[PDB]
Ligand binder design. Structure first.
Ligand SMILES: [Mg+2]
Ligand SMILES: [Mg+2]
Ligand SMILES: [Mg+2]
Ligand SMILES: [Mg+2]
Ligand SMILES: [Mg+2]
Ligand SMILES: [Mg+2]
Ligand SMILES: [Mg+2]
Ligand SMILES: [Mg+2]
Lengths: 172, 189, 136, 96, 52, 205, 190
RNA sequence: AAGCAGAACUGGCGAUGCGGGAUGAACCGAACGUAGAGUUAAGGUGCCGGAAUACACGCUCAUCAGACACCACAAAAGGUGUUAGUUCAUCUAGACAGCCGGACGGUGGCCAUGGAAGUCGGAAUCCGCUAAGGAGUGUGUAACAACUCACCGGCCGAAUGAAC
RNA sequence: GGCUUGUGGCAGUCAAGCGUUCAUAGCGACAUUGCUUUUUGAUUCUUCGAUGUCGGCUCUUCCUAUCAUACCGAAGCAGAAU
């Protein structure tokens, strides 16, 4: 799960005599495999509808590849998480090349800054900020500057040898 | 922006009806002095003030119909106000400049000239002597009142007035500077 | 009588900066920076060397002193045509960095007969150099 | 529990161990700091304790109630015949 | 001779200060938090008590 | 003189009320449960602010009495006596015991505590929107008298009723709301029509 | 937040030459020279047009960006002190015991002595830092003026003379005696 | 309350070594004939010490850091330390800061006071003028006076403030 | 001796009030969070083929929750004394 995978999961109640063709609820789920994606789908239908895995069926599961995985996209993510003392709604912005790598960045950032796990995080929405000046966070907006050029000072070079004979520099 | 909504309409409501505008300065004069200018002139001339960029944005949003208000565009500068009148210039000038001497000098201001106290009978009770004694002013009692011995200068030119040494100036009622309503510009069509 | 400030020139993470990929599947190929994801992540495109258009970490990539004109977000065809217009591969091969890379791979490609020949030729050159040291 | 009553320590811990000296001639463990502008001189001398006696002298101590008054004081006499120089030793400085 | 201007000069350094309500530190008179770590940089301050 | 509240903080025992099997409980320290303008109409005080516990624990009656006094004192000092209706929403029914070897160690009644739960309302105030900050500050000053963690929550209901502000409004321009002493009674679509005409006559227009 | 680029601006007047090595600044103007080692900062200096010098931080946090404005102010204090100088004016405050302040020479050390401070038989002495010129002003009673090229040494020397005349075991709200700083300005300002 | 006393179900120790938890009857893993080879569990891979000073995103600087499943401790309350976020409000129709100007008249508002004139206090808290100025934000006086603030206006020149 | 900390002892948070005026100079009710093991309870894990028992004397060392001394900050600190 070095990469997340985004799946669409379509499920429904079992058809009955009184109610045939149930309503075919569909969700977009981020998971590492189809087993977790189906598990997260039934977890959210337990939060939304009177249905479970025994009273419902999975009619389709498909992997959604990213439409343009080679372009850089500003993302707005709406997320709900549990802290140690309550539940909080949070909006974050990630400048990233795909949706699954932005969800990876969000989970890494949420665990780093709030000590919140995958167990305790609900992804409410991942959307593309299609134009500039709808970007709200300064840490994403600072990369939207025209012809952005920055250096990387203090380059640290990893040697394959225990001993060095040169007193290495950190030029760059 | 609600107060600006009526202020812009009132500003055009005085630009289009009053034929003479008079740009007047305001530096050290009080609300009391604006109140007495109101009471000295109700009906002859109108004082509209509240200098801001409200005025500049209003007049440059009114240059659509009259391009003769662009002369006023550079002149809105300094703590300033407008006077809307129809009466002659050398009469409205005289009525708004005739009232100069306002409330006495405030402690901690820079007195331009040198302030000095003369060797003449002051005219208050001899109990108010520690004010003269604090500055070193020589003092004798004549006919039961303070008379000064010599013409001593209490502060020199280009110096701040002290908080301790503005008290005998307040008692003696010498205030070399408060100034009145000065004017900066005249507007005619 | 003059202000003297040391400029301390640095390689910049910029659009059009040619980079060498030192870790991964490419591992010594050349790519160009097309976008900047964040402080440590960029987007690279190496179509002349066969590098895929990918978002990469700047840690596993070393910047080269070469740069060329490239618009922001240029696609693979645009990156290919402006790479050949700027002639990046010739300017890369002229550098002593790439000369040293080619020298160390030729030394690793030397066989035992060739290492005997280079030792014989090193002795032949050494005799002339030591002779010229004594004359000078 | 505590002493219930506290008294100073019996003896000085900075003179430990109370053992015999390694030689009869006690060693000078520190010398005065060298002022190089002064002429060359000896910093120490060797003598033999002969004995003690008393003196009488006038005390010059202003403020003391025995100012300008005679005091009886014990003095120790050290017999110091002139020492013979027989050698010289040089000392280099080391990180050890 | 008290020279109230010189008295006001010495009151700026000795009298016109603040006091931390926890660690008793003498502080700048319009400070918000005490500068001392041992009180936790608390915002509980008070004016220095004026003489008479 | 009293054993500290750390010995009776958590719901360790089963609920132990005053009953015919206990019969010797001392009186609670909190006796007044409605304060301020308790005769106000429902339309008078639309805003509701709650002090809600975040922990499963026990609140002693002395803590409930002390928090009532300090909250009511602050809101009376700032906004006045009649600007609010403070209702406390927990009652100290559980009886705490004290055992003053371990033979025959069953305890005698020591005091009264209110067993609370996560999300349970401790204090409720209904007031106008004018003094939302006064009520919030009074509730958070009463927060200091309680153990555990408490929260200040602005209710989206109208007053002490169970309807939201827009839902009670829609019922109020219609005739389906009639007033009472301090609460209101709502018209239903059930029952005798003769009664449903006698009360709520402004409806059926 | 790791701001990508944060930079501050240093203006160099005509008589000022500013040579900076790695982090050793040397500023020479009409009044003198001033050197300072900023090796604890980790910033980057660039010269633009011989009258304007930028200093930049790349990828800096809150504390590291906050140090950047400090460095620009310290270099600006260098230029201010090398074309205008620094002049600290201090007044003697006492009630009964007059403070006697003079300049003395022991082994050529240039000390400031303070006698009769609150009637103390102890003589207080503070050294005068090198590059600090001490004068006692005329036509103002009880005034000492400290001037020099460096605001750091002028203010520390003025603060040393202020702190050497502190009152112990007394109400300092009442006993206001001491030499206090009353003005901070420049030498060649007219 | 207890490494306290007493029950229910199950699993253990006792009766049992082995790998791990430095150490330990009960914890984790796994139960054991003698060996060889391989792969693992729990636990780990700077050095002690076998095994990456691995890769990646962040957070933290402690003049008592932290690295504790059982387990060998820490709480309420706080911090413009720093990080991330929620809500509300203001701002180029020149927002927040700093400095500069003015902060009035009825009126020393009605009472109550020994006296309280905006500032011991009770109840009210209205319009006149203005851009604006409270029947007062503080310091003061016995009461005055005086100084100060809210409120607005000179200046720049871009975002800011508050509660969480 | 070990566990616990009701009780004892020592701290803290809030701030109705005291302090002529003023919550916090100094205190501080109603509540409430803690620490310690120099009290006393509670336990009965070690010791009953014995660990000599209270106090005092003597002597050493340690802790800080500091009475004095050193240097400081605050006060309803004028000095002095606190
Ligand atoms: Mg003792
Ligand atoms: Mg129980
Ligand atoms: Mg004293
Ligand atoms: Mg047995
Ligand atoms: Mg083992
Ligand atoms: Mg362990
Ligand atoms: Mg190893
Ligand atoms: Mg024995």
């Amino acid at each position: 799960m070095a990469h997340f995978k985004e799946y669409q999961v379509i499920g429904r109640r079992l058809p009955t005599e009184s109610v045939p063709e149930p309503k075919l609820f569909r969700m977009r789920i981020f998971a590492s495999n189809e087993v977790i994606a189906k598990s997260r789908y039934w977890y959210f239908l337990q939060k939304l509808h009177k249905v479970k895995k025994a009273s419902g069926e999975i009619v389709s599961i498909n992997q959604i590849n990213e439409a343009h995985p080679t372009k850089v996209k500003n993302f707005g993510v709406w997320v709900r998480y549990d802290s140690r003392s309550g539940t909080h709604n949070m909006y974050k912005e990630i400048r990233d090349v795909s949706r699954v790598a932005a969800v990876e960045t969000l989970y890494q950032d949420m665990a780093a800054r709030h000590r919140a796990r995958f167990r305790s995080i609900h992804i409410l929405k991942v959307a593309e900020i299609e134009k500039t000046a709808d970007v709200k966070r300064q840490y994403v907006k600072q990369f939207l500057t025209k012809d952005l050029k920055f250096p990387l000072p203090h380059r640290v070079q990893k040697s394959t040898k225990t001993f060095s004979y040169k007193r290495p520099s950190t030029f760059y | 922006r609600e107060k600006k909504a009526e202020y812009f309409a009132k500003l055009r409501e005085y630009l289009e009806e009053y034929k003479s505008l008079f740009v007047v300065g305001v530096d050290n004069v009080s609300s009391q002095q604006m109140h007495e200018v109101r009471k000295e002139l109700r009906g002859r001339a109108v004082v509209l003030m509240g200098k801001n960029t409200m005025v500049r944005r209003a007049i440059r949003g009114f240059l659509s119909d009259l391009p003769d208000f662009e002369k006023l565009l550079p002149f809105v500068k300094g703590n300033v106000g407008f006077v809307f009148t129809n009466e002659p210039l050398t009469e409205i000038k005289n009525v708004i400049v005739s009232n100069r001497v306002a409330a006495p000098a405030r402690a901690g201001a820079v007195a331009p000239e040198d302030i000095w106290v003369r060797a003449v009978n002051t005219g208050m009770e001899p109990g108010k002597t520690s004010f003269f004694q604090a500055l070193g002013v020589p003092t004798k009692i004549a006919r039961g009142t303070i008379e000064i011995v010599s013409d001593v200068k209490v502060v020199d030119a280009g110096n701040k007035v002290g908080q301790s040494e503005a008290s005998l100036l307040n008692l003696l009622n010498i205030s070399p500077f408060t100034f009145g309503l000065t004017v900066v510009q005249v507007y005619d069509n | 009588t003059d202000s003297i400030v040391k400029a301390s020139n640095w390689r910049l993470v910029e659009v059009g900066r040619v980079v060498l990929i030192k870790k991964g599947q490419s591992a010594g190929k050349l790519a160009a920076i097309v976008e900047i994801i964040d402080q440590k992540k960029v987007l690279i495109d190496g179509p002349k060397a066969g590098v895929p258009r990918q978002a990469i970490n700047l840690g596993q990539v070393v910047l080269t002193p070469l740069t060329f004109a490239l618009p922001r977000g240029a696609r693979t065809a645009t990156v290919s045509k402006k790479w050949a217009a700027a002639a990046v591969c010739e300017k890369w091969a002229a550098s002593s960095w790439a000369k040293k890379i080619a020298q160390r791979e030729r030394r690793a490609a030397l066989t035992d007969f060739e290492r005997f020949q280079v030792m014989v030729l090193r002795k032949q050159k050494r005799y002339t150099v030591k002779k010229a040291l004594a004359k000078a | 529990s505590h002493r219930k009553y506290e008294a100073p320590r019996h003896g000085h811990l900075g003179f430990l161990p109370r053992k015999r000296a390694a030689s009869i001639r006690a060693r000078v463990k520190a010398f005065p700091k060298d002022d190089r502008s002064k002429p060359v001189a000896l910093t120490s001398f060797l003598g033999y304790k002969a004995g003690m006696t008393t003196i009488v002298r006038d005390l010059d101590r202003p403020g003391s109630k025995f100012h300008k008054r005679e005091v009886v004081e014990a003095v120790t006499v050290v017999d110091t015949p002139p020492v013979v120089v027989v050698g010289v030793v040089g000392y280099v400085e080391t990180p050890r | 001779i008290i020279e109230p201007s010189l008295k006001a000069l010495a009151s700026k350094y000795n009298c016109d200060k603040s006091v931390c309500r926890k660690c008793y530190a003498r502080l700048p008179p319009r400070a918000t938090n005490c500068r001392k770590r041992k009180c936790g940089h608390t915002n509980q301050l008070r004016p220095k008590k004026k003489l008479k | 003189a009293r054993r500290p509240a750390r010995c009776y903080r958590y719901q360790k025992n089963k609920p132990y009320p005053k009953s015919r099997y206990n019969r010797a409980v001392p009186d609670s320290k909190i006796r007044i449960y409605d304060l301020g303008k308790k005769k106000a109409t429902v339309d008078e005080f639309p805003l509701c602010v709650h002090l809600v516990s975040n922990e499963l624990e026990q609140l002693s009656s002395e803590a409930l009495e002390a928090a009532r006094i300090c909250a009511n004192k602050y809101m009376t000092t700032v906004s006045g006596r009649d600007a609010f209706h403070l209702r406390v929403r927990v009652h100290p029914f559980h009886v705490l015991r004290i055992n003053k070897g371990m033979r025959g160690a069953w305890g005698k009644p020591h005091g009264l505590a209110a067993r609370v739960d996560i999300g349970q309302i401790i204090f409720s105030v209904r007031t106008k929107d004018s003094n939302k900050d006064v009520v919030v500050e009074g509730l958070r000053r009463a927060r200091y008298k309680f153990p555990g963690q408490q929260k200040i929550i602005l209710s989206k209901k109208w007053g002490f009723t169970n309807l939201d502000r827009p839902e009670y409004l829609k019922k109020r321009e219609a005739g389906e709301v009639k007033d009472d002493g301090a609460f209101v009674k709502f018209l239903s679509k059930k029952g005798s029509l003769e009664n449903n005409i006698r009360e709520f006559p402004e409806y059926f227009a | 937040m790791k701001y990508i680029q944060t930079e501050q601006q240093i203006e160099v007047p005509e008589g000022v030459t500013v040579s900076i090595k790695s982090r050793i600044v040397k500023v020479v103007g009409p009044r003198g020279t001033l050197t300072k080692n900023l090796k604890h900062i980790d910033v980057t200096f660039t010269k633009v047009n011989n009258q304007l010098i930028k200093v930049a931080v790349h990828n800096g946090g809150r504390k590291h960006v906050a140090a950047l404005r400090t460095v620009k102010s310290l270099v600006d204090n260098m230029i201010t002190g090398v074309t205008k100088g620094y002049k600290y004016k201090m007044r003697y405050v006492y009630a009964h015991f007059p403070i006697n302040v003079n300049i003395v020479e022991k082994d050529g050390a240039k000390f400031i002595e303070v006698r009769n401070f609150l009637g103390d038989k102890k003589i207080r002495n503070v050294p005068v830092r090198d590059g600090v010129t001490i004068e006692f002003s005329t036509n103002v009673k009880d005034e000492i003026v400290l001037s020099g090229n460096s605001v750091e040494d002028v203010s520390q020397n003025a603060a040393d003379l202020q702190q050497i005349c502190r009152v112990r075991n007394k109400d300092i709200r009442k006993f206001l005696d001491g030499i206090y700083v009353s003005h901070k300005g420049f030498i060649t300002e007219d």
